[PDB]
Design a protein around this ligand. Structure first.
Ligand code: NI
Length: 341
């Protein structure tokens, strides 16, 4: 059965609620983004209206085979009427196609559901500037002050410089990047661009990237692995055994691998600056863990919320333990006393 924080009161709507069968009273199911924890349940057999971005719609059609008649893509930044209720979709700064949803309820209440997001000051100049929000359904993934990490731009600078230096010293090195979902495509795109290479990958991953509306994509990716010196592999293969095994397949073209595992936050963020990061190395294989996040840092979250001044906050992440719930409520009250709302 569907939990409370996935329902939008005073509507027939749910958000990211596909794993509970038929939800009583639901006339439209919204999907914020194409990540498995959120789409869990959708398939070719789904017969209710799905509302989402264009990119999420391309993924539902091609990857999950949802029929065309049930996919309802909406443009961003545009007031739309769904089942008699005004909605807006906004860019969430998460993965490709990810949105926040603003709902203008019939009784005058305004609700923002962030989905998964990486808060940014640019959001203070969207359609949110205008107006009051009575309820915030908030992505609280990193809602504690120990969660620190650098800007995506600093992390990409480190990856480009690391890869460019290694391949310039050794023209016979291969670069490998781990993936297990959509998101974080800038990591492998930026490395391939500095090296003058296309990115090589499986047919399944290629299909996924072809759904993403990335400009000039045909110029950037390929299924011909042998033509490419940046390869993508599933994240589970990014270890010394999996990488050794991969090097055997390349027919004596390469004599070194440099590999990247983009992660979220890890405890080494508590101690080591991005500049000072070093790899794990065995023989001719080196593996870098790089902290490329598509969720808000504590400080980014706090700034967004103190700006928005919502009347009530409903967390959507870390809701399963009393200690997590209590900790998050304490921070919401500090923020509110500090800023005065
Ligand atoms: Ni996500």
């Amino acid at each position: 059965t569907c939990p409370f924080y996935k329902k939008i009161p005073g509507t027939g709507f749910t958000v990211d609620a596909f794993q509970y069968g038929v939800v009583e009273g639901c006339t439209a199911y919204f999907l914020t983004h194409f990540h498995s924890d959120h789409y869990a349940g959708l398939s070719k057999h789904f017969t209710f209206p799905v509302y989402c971005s264009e990119i999420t719609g391309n993924l539902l059609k091609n990857k999950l085979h949802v029929q065309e008649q049930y996919i309802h893509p909406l443009p961003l930044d545009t007031e739309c009427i769904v089942n008699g209720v005004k909605v807006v979709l906004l860019d969430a700064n998460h993965c490709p196609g990810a949105v926040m949803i603003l709902f203008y309820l019939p009784n005058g209440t305004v609700i923002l559901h962030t989905g998964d997001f990486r808060a940014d000051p640019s959001m203070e100049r969207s359609l949110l500037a205008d107006q009051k929000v009575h309820m915030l359904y908030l992505d609280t993934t990193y809602c504690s002050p120990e969660y620190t990490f650098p800007s995506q731009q600093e992390v990409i600078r480190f990856a480009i410089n690391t890869a460019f230096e290694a391949v310039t010293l050794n023209p016979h090195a291969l670069v490998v990047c781990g993936t297990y979902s959509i998101g974080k495509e800038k990591v492998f795109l930026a490395i391939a661009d500095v090296l003058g290479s296309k990115v090589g990958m499986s047919q399944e991953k290629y299909k996924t990237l072809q759904c993403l509306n990335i400009p000039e994509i045909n110029s950037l990716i390929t299924t011909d692995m042998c033509s490419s010196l940046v390869h993508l592999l599933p994240m589970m293969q990014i270890n010394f055994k999996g990488l050794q095994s991969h090097l055997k397949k390349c027919g004596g073209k390469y004599n070194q691998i440099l590999a990247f595992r983009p992660t979220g936050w890890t405890h080494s963020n508590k101690f080591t600056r991005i500049a000072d990061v070093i790899p794990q190395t065995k023989g001719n294989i080196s593996i870098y863990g790089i902290p490329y996040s598509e969720h808000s840092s504590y400080l980014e979250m706090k700034r967004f919320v103190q700006w928005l001044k919502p009347q009530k906050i409903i967390p959507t992440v870390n809701v399963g333990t009393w200690k997590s719930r209590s900790t998050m409520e304490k921070y919401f009250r500090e923020w509110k006393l500090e800023a005065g709302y």
